[PDB]
């Protein structure tokens, strides 16, 4: 190619979107934004294929141009805006608030939250550095640059950000025993507690996580997201609380409830 | 020892020995060198066009004889003359001198049978479903 691409084939789209393979030939390409293309849920998919409020892309555009949708407290009018992990989506007309958190299966879930919980979000500190004029700042996983951070905040920590002011209200250090959420790999969507961080210089650090059922799994440090102390997450968790269940157990539960 | 290397680090000798020896097969040699169609009756084609020179058995007394169904045809591709069968003398009426005939593989020595004449199937003509265009 001679420049950036602008089209996305349906078969090439992220699997977790759960798009019909025969509905069309193209899928919404997420516009540039806070979250990476493959880790993001464009607003069209959320409003149409998840909430079912809109029956087609044109109706999604009609909804957005009415300014009814806010992402992290700010109105967005782009159909393919890349909403992503820990993003608060507010619909005032419906009096509804959502937080985009993976379910255990590895797909963004329709998780409703309260207004108080919609006032803040969490962000993994991806970088900490001095800017111009010697003003320290932290860069989080959604591209937010926050100046004058608490000096104790280091990389891999999780900062609680207030959406109204975009200021750090609280922070959580990365340490053993902390409650974490897996945001990548085949263990995506699971919740557990750190046991041990294996450090390899010049390579990828691995973290061993123990879930509530005592199962243990190893994941790269890039996919880990601290969300609180054990049993006391800073956010309301989805149904199932991030616990993986074997196919037989899922069958048993499904038959029991049916 | 069976006359072959068996050491665990002898893969190269086994590969190279095999590659040299596959050329002994005639099937392999023909397949790679693209000479498998020299033996084919039509030189690689499934059908051949020809020009009807003469009907050799037109005069034979016994009706529907094997000789009566033979026609001497000239292959257009190379000009070699060959003999071809006709399904029956009734079909032999349709075939006449100087028509293009499509031949297919089949009195020993006759290895071809006519399937089309003047671009029309003989079986279509024999069943009275088409007319020969001239």
């Amino acid at each position: 190619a001679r420049g950036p691409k602008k089209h996305l084939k349906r078969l090439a789209a992220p699997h977790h979107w759960l798009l019909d393979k025969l509905s069309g030939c193209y899928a919404p390409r997420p516009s540039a934004g806070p979250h990476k293309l493959r880790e993001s849920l464009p607003l069209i998919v959320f409003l149409r294929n998840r909430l079912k409020y809109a029956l087609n892309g044109r109706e999604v555009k009609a909804i957005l141009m009415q300014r009814h949708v806010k992402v992290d407290g700010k109105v967005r009018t782009d159909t393919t805006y890349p909403a992503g992990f820990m993003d608060v989506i507010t619909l005032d007309a419906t009096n509804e608030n959502f937080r985009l958190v993976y379910d255990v299966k590895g797909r963004f879930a329709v998780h409703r939250i309260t207004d108080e919980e919609a006032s803040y979000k969490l962000g993994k500190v991806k970088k900490v550095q001095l800017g111009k004029k010697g003003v320290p700042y932290v860069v989080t996983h959604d591209g937010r640059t926050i100046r004058y951070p608490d000096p104790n905040i280091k990389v891999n920590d999780t900062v609680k950000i207030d959406l109204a002011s975009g200021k750090i209200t609280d922070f959580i250090k990365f340490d053993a025993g902390k409650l974490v959420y897996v945001t990548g790999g085949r263990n995506l969507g699971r919740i557990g507690t750190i046991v041990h961080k294996e450090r390899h210089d010049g390579g990828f650090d691995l973290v061993h996580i123990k879930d509530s059922l005592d199962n243990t799994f190893v994941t790269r440090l890039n996919n880990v997201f601290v969300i609180g102390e054990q049993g006391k997450p800073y956010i309301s968790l989805p149904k199932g609380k991030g616990i993986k269940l074997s196919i037989a157990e899922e069958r048993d539960r499904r038959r029991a409830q049916q | 020892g069976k006359g072959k290397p068996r050491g665990l680090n002898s893969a190269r000798k086994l590969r190279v020995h095999r590659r040299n020896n596959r050329w002994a097969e005639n099937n392999y040699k023909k397949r790679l060198l693209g000479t498998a169609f020299k033996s084919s009756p039509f030189g690689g084609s499934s059908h051949a066009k020809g020009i009807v020179l003469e009907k050799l058995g037109i005069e034979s007394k016994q009706p529907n004889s094997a000789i009566r169904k033979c026609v001497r045809v000239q292959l257009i591709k190379n000009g070699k003359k060959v003999t071809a069968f006709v399904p029956n003398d009734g079909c032999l009426n349709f075939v006449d001198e100087n028509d293009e005939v499509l031949l297919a593989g089949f009195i020993p020595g006759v290895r071809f049978k006519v399937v089309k004449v003047s671009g029309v199937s003989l079986l279509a003509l024999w069943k009275e479903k088409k007319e020969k265009p001239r």
Partner: protein
């Protein structure tokens, strides 16, 4: 371009179609069940071969294997649901004991014949293809329709059919009008 839509062949030619015993078996099957052609028998044989190969492969797995347990239970549940396998024979060994006749008996043609709605398998086929048979509230015109155990008790004449309480067909009212005139 749009993504491909999958397709598959529901039958296969047998290894030796020309075995005399095989020819006689196909003749008996077609006559007993009123099958149109050997394609239907090949189709049922292909399904049965697939099922039995799956069962054999599961049996090769060690007992208590999670894959064996899950897949074998699902397969046995399906076979019991369609009616081929009896309730008391819920094991993979009895899945290998199935035969083409078991599947053929479940066809809507044979069931319509057996329930007394038709006087022969051919009469049942004609009744089905002419839209006289309803499984529940749904008219079914496919003789190969495989009846489930629950569906077995709901086969009846369709509400729209002349035999099911609707008005007489075209011939009946035609003749009635000609008699009246």
């Amino acid at each position: 371009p749009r993504a491909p839509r999958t397709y598959s062949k529901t039958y296969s030619t047998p290894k030796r179609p020309y075995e005399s015993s095989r020819l006689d078996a196909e003749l008996k099957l077609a006559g007993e069940f009123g099958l149109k052609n050997k394609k239907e028998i090949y189709r049922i044989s292909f399904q049965l071969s697939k099922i039995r190969r799956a069962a054999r492969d599961l049996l090769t797995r060690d007992e208590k294997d999670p894959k064996r347990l899950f897949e074998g239970n699902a397969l046995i549940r399906r076979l019991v649901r369609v009616g081929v396998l009896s309730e008391d024979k819920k094991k993979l060994d009895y899945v290998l004991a199935l035969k083409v006749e078991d599947f053929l008996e479940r066809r809507l043609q044979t069931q319509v014949y057996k329930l007394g709605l038709a006087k022969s398998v051919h009469h049942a086929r004609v009744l089905i293809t002419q839209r006289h048979i309803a499984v529940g509230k749904q008219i079914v015109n496919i003789p190969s329709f495989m009846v489930r155990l629950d569906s077995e008790k709901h086969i009846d004449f369709a509400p729209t059919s002349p035999f099911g309480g609707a008005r007489p067909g075209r011939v009946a009212r035609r003749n009635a009008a000609r008699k009246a005139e």
